[PDB]
Amino acid sequence: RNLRVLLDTAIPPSFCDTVSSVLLDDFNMVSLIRTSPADSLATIKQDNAEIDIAITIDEELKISRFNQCVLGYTKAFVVAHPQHPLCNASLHSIASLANYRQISLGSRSGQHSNLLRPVSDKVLFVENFDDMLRLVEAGVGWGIAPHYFVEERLRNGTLAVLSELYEPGGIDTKVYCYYNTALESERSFLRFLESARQRLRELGRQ
Numbered sequence: 001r002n003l004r005v006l007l008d009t010a011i012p013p014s015f016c017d018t019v020s021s022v023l024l025d026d027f028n029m030v031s032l033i034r035t036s037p038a039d040s041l042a043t044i045k046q047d048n049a050e051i052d053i054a055i056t057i058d059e060e061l062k063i064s065r066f067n068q069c070v071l072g073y074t075k076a077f078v079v080a081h082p083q084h085p086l087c088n089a090s091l092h093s094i095a096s097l098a099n100y101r102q103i104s105l106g107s108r109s110g111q112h113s114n115l116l117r118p119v120s121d122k123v124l125f126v127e128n129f130d131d132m133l134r135l136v137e138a139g140v141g142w143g144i145a146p147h148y149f150v151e152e153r154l155r156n157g158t159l160a161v162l163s164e165l166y167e168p169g170g171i172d173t174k175v176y177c178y179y180n181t182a183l184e185s186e187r188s189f190l191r192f193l194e195s196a197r198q199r200l201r202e203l204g205r206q
């Protein structure tokens with residue numbers, strides 16, 4: 001119960017804090033680590049890190065030494081500069097964006113999971129969301145960003161949304177919890193899962 005825990009940058013801060021409080025309520029030593037989802041699954045896989053619990057959106061069912069569960073959901077938007085070509089065109093489609101350039105997270109130096117795989121042939125990789133939104137806000141391209149990162153810049157006109165046809169409201173991605181196999185038998189972990197999940201649901205509806 002000396003715990004190392006990972007959360008990705010798509011996890012809303014309210015989400016990570018909701019988790020933290022519970023973790024400390026049921027494990028008394030909790031160390032928190034943050035990474036962008038592209039590097040999330042890789043980090044836990046490197047055994048030199050000793051991550052016991054990881055909360056991310058990238059999935060691989062062949063993860064060794066780790067089991068899986070769903071902890072809740074988060075939302076994401078296809079955002080782009082207000083004067084971007086697509087923004088003008090009101091009919092946006094998965095093909096229509098394959099032509100224009102995508103600012104995307106991660107590195108070409110890695111197994112691009114389907115979830116974080118670039119959908120377009122013309123791409124530019126960045127390493128965090130701040131650099132993604134800097135480029136997108138300069139018309140470089142379009143991107144897929146979490147809610148908490150962009151919400152304000154869209155209610156402010158700084159940015160726009162092209163995802164209001166595909167999934168009106170945001171692209172509901174699942175948020176996964178990866179427990180080290182060993183932790184399955186510790187009543188602390190299971191109580192964490194219960195209390196956290198409830199709290200997350202309660203916050204989500206609001």
Ligand SMILES: CC(C)Oc1ccc(-c2ncc(CNc3ccnc(C(F)(F)F)c3)s2)cc1Cl
Nearest residue numbers: 010076078093094115144145146162163166173
């Ligand atoms: C606009 C529409 C017509 O076309 C699309 C429809 C669906 C998609 C999705 N792509 C990744 C999906 C999973 N969720 C992700 C993936 C990566 N990154 C995040 C982050 F956390 F960063 F927000 C969340 S859904 C893309 C496009 Cl372009």
